[PDB]
Write a protein that binds this ligand. Structure first.
Ligand SMILES: NC(=O)c1ccc[n+]([C@@H]2O[C@H](COP(=O)([O-])OP(=O)(O)OC[C@H]3O[C@@H](n4cnc5c(N)ncnc54)[C@H](OP(=O)(O)O)[C@@H]3O)[C@@H](O)[C@H]2O)c1
Ligand SMILES: NC(=O)c1ccc[n+]([C@@H]2O[C@H](COP(=O)([O-])OP(=O)(O)OC[C@H]3O[C@@H](n4cnc5c(N)ncnc54)[C@H](OP(=O)(O)O)[C@@H]3O)[C@@H](O)[C@H]2O)c1
Ligand SMILES: NC(=O)c1ccc[n+]([C@@H]2O[C@H](COP(=O)([O-])OP(=O)(O)OC[C@H]3O[C@@H](n4cnc5c(N)ncnc54)[C@H](OP(=O)(O)O)[C@@H]3O)[C@@H](O)[C@H]2O)c1
Lengths: 326, 114, 326, 326
């Protein structure tokens, strides 16, 4: 119902849908296509756009940076996020040390051609860097004007809470967001771990991959279509899990979920995305698209969100049978 | 959940500090159940606040640290300390031990007069 | 008696009268008139000048910025304030989040052509942004050299006190001022709520609209004069309250207050302004004027301030009958 | 075994070997030789490079700064350290005051042509400057972006712990590293004093002079070879200790240690360097070299580190007889 919503218990207002740049920007799709995909999202009210320094070895932030500069959109009207962890072959170019957090974020801002990102994420937990060093570094870049907020990604709820403690301990800035994978076949974290942190310390969730890299779309019940993500170089790992034992088992359950999509007058990608936004602890879902027909179809998941009854939600939890034990 | 994560409990200005594994020992109590105690959490200080009696909580926290020893302090009234045990929800099996340690138709009608 | 006075319990010395820019600058009056009005105020000892990013959609700060640059006045001799809340159509361009407080104040400084404002206000309370985020953002812009002090506007005394708590909690900078409406027909806040905060935490009051947008001047007892504020586009709301049931009732009470003005050898606008400065908790009153004859007349309220006896103050509280129950 | 290792309990990853610039850069060796020595170290995985403002009266940082600029190496791939204490003849140009820490580090960054060093050290304890002033100054340059971390050099464990206390006392940044002399004839500090701080507050040790300025290499059992360090101007102090009473006694013990080198299929410099890295509290050893044959020989000490058995370690502690009483 309500389109925009706060990113956790903070003042940053993001749209419930966001456009990511993994795989697509600077790799799968042309720059002319990326501009068209972003202009559609921006003209439809989406303000949240996600990227990382590891996507396309920096070419994704470059493509994203040129679209923003070309279209001339107001920086105040955009919510740009970036993730820092993998920044080069060298030893000191990876992790969450104060050296790479500052160097990596500065390098991303150069490619993005932006003075600051709205949120800077830790793309994964770094067991080599002490929590105090990471929190001080994240607070430092915020106070230096390179970022407005900072969040975590792939951190356990025990680690997110620790960063909140170290922040309160040394009068620093706690994290406000957590990027966790969340779709119909990955539910243990957002539905069990995170909601306790959303009510306790107010950390919101910005979930990624709502269609399991396109698996939920049902385009794989026959095989691996050409030009799809599974057919791409570097994504043999995805093709393995699709044609594996569990892969065919998931495709069978999508056939039943398809009937729920037709009954609700929508597609299956729209049902899966609307299924993610059904939680109050989910501040936004990051979409992915390689063509304009996919994007504006996935934007239509907002229509399906009111049509989600607890009877339907219970109906889907029976087809999947993966309801996490609370 | 038994994870050495530290918990700060503030009793009317008196600061208490213990491990989460200590409170998770008794999940049926107030401080032991994450759902019951969250109503008292302060995200600005990372502590749980309680606007209640201060001399009583010494034995309340030690009830978790010792594993079941519930002994009223020598300076806390008996009626006040007993009302604190019911707030923190230590349990009837624990309340009974505290009382033991403290030293504590026609047929029915004719049966009353005699 | 004493012209200049401290802004609350702080070291910033403001004149008891200040010139605002609502309605007039960049809208009702020409830029050549605005320059003349400001030069009169500055040449008469007024150092406090008020504006906001919402007035004339940014044109008010632009006009104000050009006068200061043209006249070549010493920046050290001016006290420039600005208010931040409404900054554009977009979702992330409104509120008191760290994103808009920094972006909105930076944009105001660009239009003002100034490196910093002396005070930055929160134009209204923002129920979407946590208090800790707003206080950190206000402290951040102060430590970054974009502002000297920060204050609140339209906040309840419970919210102002909370910002003071969160400031002391995290070793941040508390607010020093509160802009509240205060005239003979709006008295509940400055006379009851605020004086407790002035003695406890020393938050001063910089009251706005001392003549109820010109109603107290008595120019409406016949009708809506041409070229006045009530005849302006976008101010039908004011014309409604003037010709309403209470509107004629207020005009009747001004007839009695006029006799007090003649008895004191002054006008009615001067009496109403001097009536506002009668409190020690009022650090300054923000004036408004569309011509030079109005301004230098309103400046004459300083003469009426000594002539305010407690007998006269009690006499006015009987005509209004709105003495707030302490 | 494991090449790179953390600098103490911090996130900065340094190689176990580092190339220093004392004596050599800007003094003993030509700039063309210094470039060749550094390119060999960098091409072999060494990222840690050490210097000071006192080495060659600033010419060492200049030579080091030109190599980095010429080769075009990524700043993110380098770990550059500098030490501040001796900065000129004047009275205010020496010590650990806030004046010289800021002025001295700024001057080093100018010669280094770098925006920041990764670590800034206090080259020696300063009994004239209070600990609070030094810690605030070290925290200040870190927060100003002139340095990433700061450490101590030649400080006693009692002083290092005090800086850690004053840091925790005033919410400042504690030190992460300590540069202490450590070779087979100087062992009391790294083997007794420091390991308590490595487990308590996690301060790592970056040891310097692993060959006693070349004495351990065994090139002095006959006399003072030409072009060596002992034959250099300004190093008569070294020539005195070599030909002194203890000097010949140390050369006699090197003859026995030579047999251990041949038994392990390595040289004596390699054995002494690998002997230093045998401690977990030693985060890195700073090498020194005047020709390329010395450097790539000393780099081979990594091969000897696995071949170090506790039987061999006990065998060397018997030849030296200087095992520090724990
Ligand atoms: N925090 C992290 O570690 C992390 C990890 C991953 C992603 N992310 C963020 O989250 C975003 C999520 O991306 P995602 O790839 O996971 O998105 P997704 O929704 O899981 O899948 C997107 C992909 O599925 C296919 N697809 C999308 N819409 C479709 C439709 N309507 N019909 C049929 N196929 C469709 C497209 O692939 P083809 O057309 O190529 O088949 C598209 O590239 C990323 O862009 C990134 O910003 C974050
Ligand atoms: N914090 C906030 O939210 C807030 C809100 C409003 C204002 N403010 C600040 O406070 C200032 C107050 O402005 P205001 O409009 O409230 O001032 P006001 O004193 O209430 O009324 C000023 C208006 O009344 C008329 N007027 C002024 N002097 C007069 C005189 N001597 N005789 C007859 N008519 C006279 C003029 O209007 P006409 O000539 O057009 O009739 C003038 O524009 C603003 O400039 C703004 O800076 C702040
Ligand atoms: N914190 C401090 O106060 C402090 C003090 C000193 C040094 N340091 C740092 O630590 C580094 C240590 O330098 P160091 O001079 O002590 O190094 P070292 O290992 O003690 O000796 C290096 C010197 O020994 C000779 N040498 C090196 N390798 C050799 C080999 N394989 N065979 C024969 N001779 C060899 C060379 O001198 P010749 O060829 O000239 O004989 C070379 O200059 C310095 O560069 C500096 O960065 C710090």
């Amino acid at each position: 119902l309500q389109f925009y919503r706060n990113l956790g218990k903070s003042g940053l207002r993001v749209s419930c849908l966001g456009l990511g740049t993994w795989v697509t920007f600077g790799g799968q799709i042309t720059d002319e296509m990326a501009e068209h995909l972003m202009t559609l999202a921006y003209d439809n009210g989406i303000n949240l756009f996600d990227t990382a320094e590891v996507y396309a070895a920096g070419k994704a932030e470059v493509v994203l940076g040129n679209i923003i500069k070309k279209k001339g959109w107001r920086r105040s009207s955009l919510v740009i996020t970036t993730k820092i962890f993998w920044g080069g072959k060298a030893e000191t170019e990876r992790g969450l040390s104060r050296k790479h957090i500052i160097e990596g974020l500065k390098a991303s801002l150069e490619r993005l051609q932006l003075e600051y990102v709205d949120v800077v994420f830790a793309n994964r937990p770094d067991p080599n860097t002490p929590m105090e060093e990471t929190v001080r570094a994240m607070t430092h870049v915020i106070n230096q004007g390179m970022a407005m907020y900072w969040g975590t990604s792939r951190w356990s709820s025990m680690e997110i809470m620790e960063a909140y403690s170290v922040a309160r301990q040394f009068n620093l800035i706690p994290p406000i967001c957590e990027q966790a994978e969340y779709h119909m076949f990955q539910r243990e974290k957002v539905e069990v771990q995170l909601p306790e942190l959303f009510h306790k310390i107010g950390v919101g969730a910005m979930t990624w991959s709502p269609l399991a890299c396109g698996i939920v779309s049902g385009k794989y019940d026959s095989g691996i279509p050409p030009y799809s993500r599974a057919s791409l170089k570097g994504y043999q790992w995805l093709k393995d899990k699709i044609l594996s034992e569990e892969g065919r088992r998931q495709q069978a359950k999508l056939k039943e979920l398809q009937a729920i999509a037709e009954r609700l007058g929508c597609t299956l990608p729209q049902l899966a995305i609307a299924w993610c936004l059904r939680n109050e602890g989910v501040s936004s879902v990051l979409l992915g698209a390689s063509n304009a027909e996919q994007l504006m179809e996935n934007i239509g998941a907002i229509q399906v969100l009111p049509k989600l009854s607890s009877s339907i939600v219970h109906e889907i939890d029976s087809i999947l049978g993966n309801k996490p034990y609370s | 959940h038994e994870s050495s994560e530290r918990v700060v409990i503030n009793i009317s200005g008196l600061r208490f500090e213990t491990q989460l594994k200590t409170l998770a020992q008794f999940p049926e109590t107030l401080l032991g159940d994450p759902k019951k105690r969250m109503r008292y959490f302060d995200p600005l200080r990372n502590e749980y606040f309680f606007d209640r009696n201060r001399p009583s909580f010494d034995a309340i926290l030690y009830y978790y640290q010792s594993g079941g020893r519930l002994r009223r302090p020598v300076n806390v009234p008996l009626d006040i300390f007993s009302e604190e045990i019911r707030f923190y929800e230590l349990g009837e099996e624990a309340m009974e031990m505290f009382r033991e340690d403290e030293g504590y138709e026609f047929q029915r009608q004719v049966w009353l007069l005699f």
